[PDB]
């Protein structure tokens, strides 16, 4: 059973059918056993794609609503609301998986940081469309606990620790409107990883996140 | 209301939500008025995106299905589920063409455009048909293209992008579905040469380049 659902999720991924992929990995998670690295990466990939499509459509429609008659504005508004409901339902589904299964079963610091980052991300997507104060604080609290754990248990070049710093820096910039704290957090993460330059299997992923941290710093300084 | 359905379809398009876009254009069509050129292009774009997603997925999974026992059956079943979606999309489009678009089309340009679309959607059914229901599907695609082909040769300039795109797709039908590369090459080269002889020009020269790219691929 669990095996078959994982193989169906992989098939759906190759077919670029991410809603199918996410439904497979949701069912795996609901079986209540701690996920392997491979399973949690499938779950993360599936939902990031599913929510990413809705966030992209929301930005396009939200903006059309803001640049607009009255009949046309209202159409855009109602369509924005429809996409928002899809996006909210997806975030709530992931956050429910995180509360009920993933975070309670996480037996290692690496996975606890992984899931607390995910929780930070999905409240941050809720914050993008938000009630907003409470959502923002839930995001900030998940990131902050992830951040403390990763600093205590992970090397500064660990891709999960770097990816957490990238996303928490984006949260400070874009959600909290605290650009100086965003730049401070991103520059420290980049500089500490440069100082300790890593195993074979992580070269590519750590350094790719380093490039994104520096690209954000370039953008936010220029 | 037509006009507001059309606005919704443009917004769906902007949001890259092509299933929403197609549902809006299906509703516009089902109001029974002849579609404007803008509406016709919206309908075509929406469904070409919606069916294109399933054809792309089908090709991936089908490929895995063949290149592999419990795992072969799982791929087979998934391929079947994608095929059902694809077949339902094509059937939807083909009903709209039969019931509303082809009978109401009052200009040769429209009539060619929709008969080509009918050739196309039976061709996508032909790509996934197996067993006994294939020869009849292939024949329906061929007959639709042939009708479109005879009207376009009579009524349209050889450089008209609709006439050129019909030659492009009909030549693909002969190559990929009828396994008739000589007929495919001859149809594509004639369409190219006839447009050269009598030389929307951006669309026209783009499709001429595609005609000659297929000739190069099929010769090579």
């Amino acid at each position: 059973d669990k095996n078959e659902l994982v193989q169906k999720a992989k098939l759906a991924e190759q077919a670029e059918r991410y809603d199918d992929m996410a439904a497979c990995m949701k069912s795996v998670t609901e079986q209540g056993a701690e996920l392997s690295n491979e399973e949690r990466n499938l779950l993360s990939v599936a939902y990031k794609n599913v929510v990413g499509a809705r966030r992209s459509s929301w930005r396009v429609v939200s903006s059309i609503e803001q640049k607009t008659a009255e009949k046309k504005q209202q159409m855009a508004r109602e369509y924005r609301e429809k996409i928002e409901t899809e996006l909210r339902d997806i975030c709530n589904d992931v956050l429910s998986l995180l509360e009920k299964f993933l975070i309670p079963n996480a037996s290692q610091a690496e996975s606890k940081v992984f899931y607390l980052k995910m929780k930070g991300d999905y409240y941050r997507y809720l914050a993008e469309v938000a009630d907003k104060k409470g959502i923002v604080d839930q995001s900030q609290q998940a990131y902050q606990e992830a951040f403390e754990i990763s600093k205590k248990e992970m090397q500064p070049t660990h891709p999960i620790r770097l990816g957490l710093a990238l996303n928490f820096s984006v949260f400070y910039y874009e959600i909290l409107n605290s650009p100086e704290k965003a730049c401070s957090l991103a520059k420290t993460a980049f500089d500490e990883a440069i100082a300790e330059l890593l195993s074979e299997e992580s070269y590519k992923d750590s350094t790719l996140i380093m490039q994104l941290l520096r690209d954000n710093l370039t953008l936010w300084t220029s | 209301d037509k006009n507001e359905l059309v606005q919704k379809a443009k917004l769906a398009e902007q949001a890259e939500r092509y299933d929403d876009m197609a549902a809006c254009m299906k509703s516009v069509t089902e109001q029974g008025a002849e579609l404007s050129n803008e509406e016709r292009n919206l309908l075509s774009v929406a469904y070409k995106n919606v069916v294109g997603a399933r054809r792309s997925s089908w090709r991936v999974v089908s490929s895995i299905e063949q290149k592999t026992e419990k795992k072969q059956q799982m791929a087979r079943e998934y391929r079947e589920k994608i095929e059902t979606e694809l077949r339902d999309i094509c059937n939807d489009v083909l009903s709209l063409l039969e019931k509303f678009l082809i009978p109401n089309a009052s200009q040769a340009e429209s009539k060619v455009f929709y008969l080509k679309m009918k050739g196309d959607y039976y061709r996508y059914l032909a790509e996934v048909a197996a067993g006994d229901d294939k020869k009849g599907i292939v024949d329906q695609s061929q007959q639709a293209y042939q009708e479109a082909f005879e009207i376009s040769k009579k009524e349209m300039q050889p450089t008209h992008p609709i006439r050129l795109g019909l030659a492009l797709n009909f030549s693909v039908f002969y190559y990929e579905i009828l396994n008739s590369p000589e007929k495919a090459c001859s149809l594509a080269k004639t369409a190219f040469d006839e447009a050269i002889a009598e030389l929307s020009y951006k669309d026209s020269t783009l499709i001429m380049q595609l005609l000659r790219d297929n000739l190069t691929l099929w010769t090579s």
Partner: peptide
């Protein structure tokens, strides 16, 4: 913009 963590041809759309 800012970043967070990550055969024959037929007729195309016009």
């Amino acid at each position: 913009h800012r970043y967070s963590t990550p055969r024959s041809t037929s007729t195309p759309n016009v």
